[PDB]
Amino acid sequence: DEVWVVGMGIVMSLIVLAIVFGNVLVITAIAKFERLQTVTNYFITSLACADLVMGLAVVPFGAAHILMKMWTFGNFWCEFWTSIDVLCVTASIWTLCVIAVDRYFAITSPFKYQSLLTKNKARVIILMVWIVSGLTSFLPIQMHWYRATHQEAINCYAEETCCDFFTNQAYAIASSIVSFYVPLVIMVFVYSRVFQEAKRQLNIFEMLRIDEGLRLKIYKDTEGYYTIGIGHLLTKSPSLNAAKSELDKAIGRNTNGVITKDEAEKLFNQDVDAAVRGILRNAKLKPVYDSLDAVRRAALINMVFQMGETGVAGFTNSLRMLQQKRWDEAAVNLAKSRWYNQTPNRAKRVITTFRTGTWDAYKFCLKEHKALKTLGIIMGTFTLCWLPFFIVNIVHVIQDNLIRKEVYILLNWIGYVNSGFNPLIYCRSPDFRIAFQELLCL
Ligand SMILES: CC(C)CCC[C@@H](C)[C@H]1CC[C@H]2[C@@H]3CC=C4C[C@@H](O)CC[C@]4(C)[C@H]3CC[C@]12C
């Protein structure tokens, strides 16, 4: 139908436009802004490149093959088009597997969020991917090791107006296992460990950085008292110079109301140490700290950090039920407090920690932890976009008459739309957000 062709033509054009402009913007943002020239962003550059090659050389000719129902580019370009197509996908899934593995080695290292690979080393890994995956994508098609022995296929090979991808059962299993499933199985298992390590390796220092936050300039909290760094109270006095005086003495230099990351961490390491020391000095809190597990020990430290040894001691009724290990019971009395009303968002997180005995409340609450979530969304979406096509592709190998030709192309296109999703997912990263709007002048 006429309306169907024009209708599909517009949909496919807006898909192609979204692929190219999206990835160009991403590549441009990493190339221009220094703050985005990281090891993990260099892998994203390789991912965005493969996604750009898709919408520039693959997807455009794919559309013409559907709207005209015939190949009008020759048998040399037909095989080259298919070779690039496979490479784009193979390079993308291996890139995602590398990102996953590099994230495991970073989280297991004492660096926790910084990569063990250098900028020169990362370039080698990317170049090795494109070379290795380039060989497994071009050699099995150019040497015609992919060609089937049935008449319908040999007729399509000889025909210059036929580019229907016909294959033998061997290649269909071999190429799909090496190219897609092997990096996918590894990626899923390795990045599930990355998520498991992130949640498990959560500590009080990260927990307070989540709750209190970070600001290197003097600000007023909910209570209204002068604060700086990670919830470090300066004075209860409503005077800026009084707040500045107590600050310059603590650091030991002319700060002028501004501190560094090195300085903010230094006072934070002191406050945390003072909180625990205050618990050990307090007779009411001392036996409660003993009975609690590592996770709930941090939750008591968190309250002592915000209110103070004396303030936390006032919850006599609640503390008694923490010792009794009746978490759900203690939580109700903790909720029935002025502290709960003062900071409900922070109170919920701390109360839930006591209830669960896990960091489940502080799940992806950290900025470094949000970065991992975004990368997990990229890998997970690639799976949802490509796995249906790959399952049906291997189902076709076992039984020939299982699915129609229209089902194969439709599922292949589900994977094609994926090359337009990745730039929109980078909107989660505030570093990319600022880069994008700067290049778009908004
Ligand atoms: C279609 C085929 C033949 C062309 C393949 C394109 C090749 C040349 C491209 C695609 C991805 C590219 C890489 C993307 C990532 C980076 C990070 C950047 O900081 C330095 C260059 C480097 C390492 C690129 C080198 C060239 C590269 C490997």
Ligand SMILES: CC(C)(C)NC[C@H](O)COc1nsnc1N1CCOCC1
């Ligand atoms: C069939 C067509 C139109 C050339 N698209 C190819 C697909 O987009 C993906 O191709 C692949 N990339 S990695 N492994 C594969 N496959 C899928 C098709 O069968 C051979 C192995």
